[PDB]
């Protein structure tokens with residue numbers, strides 16, 4: 001087989017469809033095509049696709065935001081993981097989510113925010129947990145108390161029909177850090193429906209630098225994940241495993257950077 | 267195998283991510299999993315994926331906005347097509363794109379628009395050609411001259427860094443019909459960057475009812491494609507072909523409807 005299976009939480013999140021496009025490019029450079037498999041952050045869908053990919057004898061699997069552990073132990077096909085650690089013998093590639101969360105706090109604080117909310121991601125996403133921890137560590141360094149709201153899912157179309165309890169109070173914050181750009185878009189939509197002015201009344205920073213942050217208005221200040229470097233790295237390492245080349249099985253963490261746009265003041 | 271290959275022409279476009287999610291649900295109801303294959307509206311990528319899916323002996327293929335023809339002749343795997351016709355012995359499922367184009371014209375005209383632009387899709391998309399023809403036939407019935415601008419691609423992230431020549435003149439139109447909702451979002455972003463008020467200065471209608479129109483602000487008036495009915499139908503018909511059950515090979519066209527939101531005046 002010259003096909004690699006890429007498991008995607010959902011390509012409805014712009015970040016994952018862009019990642020899938022760029023991984024496909026790097027795979028093509030190495031002579032591979034891709035099958036994309038939608039796992040929807042569901043352990044049983046992931047298990048099913050692992051079985052289906054194995055039965056189809058793909059050359060390798062890229063496992064994004066995995067919720068398994070067990071299931072991977074016997075599979076005899078090369079695997080690399082994006083974000084979530086699976087087993088100690090599978091390489092995990094990620095952005096520097098801890099430091100990105102610190103950068104997000106430092107940016108809001110530098111822009112004068114003192115009443116701060118972090119809309120954090122589901123606990124099962126190692127990446128969002130690290131963003132939360134970096135943000136909180138930043139607040140602790142400034143002796144600032146922060147409020148949290150924890151979403152239980154990444155973006156789903158149903159989110160557009162869901163309310164936040166006490167949405168009327170959100171405008172009272174100086175700044176809000178939202179765990180990713182697509183979730184930030186939903187938060188800004190809710191604020192706009194209530195007539196809230198951004199950034200005049202509240203400042204917003206997201207995470208990813210996915211296309212949704214530039215597509216909408218005002219454009220979203222965010223933390224860049226380096227999709228090209230992530231995709232390059234994932235494919236380079238998977239091909240080493242496929243080829244039986246030596247590589248230390250350890251974390252590969254790519255640098256992030258602040259992208260200042262119109263939802264924070266300057 | 268119990269796997270169906272779904273060719274996806276634009277994994278960046280909300281409409282196709284939502285279609286893929288719903289097709290997956292209906293396939294699961296019938297006992298099938300899906301592999302998604304990114305064709306990127308490229309004939310060579312489609313040809314490649316067709317070969318890869320055949321080599322993997324999938325149970326059936328859902329072609330989507332296909333640009334091939336003879337490559338499908340005697341591939342001995344069941345195929346159904348979304349939108350673009352492939353061969354006379356392959357069923358094509360689509361929304362009622364001609365009537366949706368007429369509905370879009372009628373709605374702008376009823377809201378008082380007389381200086382009207384249609385940003386039309388690539389000529390290789392049968393669906394957008396029919397939207398253009400329905401819109402134009404509506405204009406001709408009212409003895410109204412319409413202007414056209416023809417995009418050569420569906421949404422790509424690079425569109426966010428591309429300008430329309432004479433963009434500063436677009437505000438002069440009363441109303442704009444854009445060939446789909448994700449393209450409409452890009453047009454609205456350009457207008458907003460220039461300080462144009464929607465719908466006060468220009469009214470906008472898209473096509474699809476994909477989730478981006480409900481993230482847009484103001485929310486986007488559009489023509490609904492019935493994703494649930496499309497997905498149900500694609501899977502029902504593909505399973506008939508797989509099972510060798512009788513079915514007339516003919517067009518299946520699903521009804522569309524206007525969804526009035528905030529980018530046209532109520």
Ligand SMILES: OC[C@@]1(O)OC[C@@H](O)[C@@H]1O
Nearest residue numbers: 013015125127128180208
């Ligand atoms: O949008 C993608 C993302 O930011 O969502 C949360 C995190 O898991 C991932 O990197």
Ligand SMILES: OC[C@@]1(O)OC[C@@H](O)[C@@H]1O
Nearest residue numbers: 279281391393394446474
């Ligand atoms: O967005 C999806 C879509 O509207 O794009 C153009 C048309 O091919 C298709 O139905």
Ligand code: NA
Nearest residue numbers: 171172173201
């Ligand atoms: Na505030």
Ligand code: NA
Nearest residue numbers: 437438439467
């Ligand atoms: Na106008």
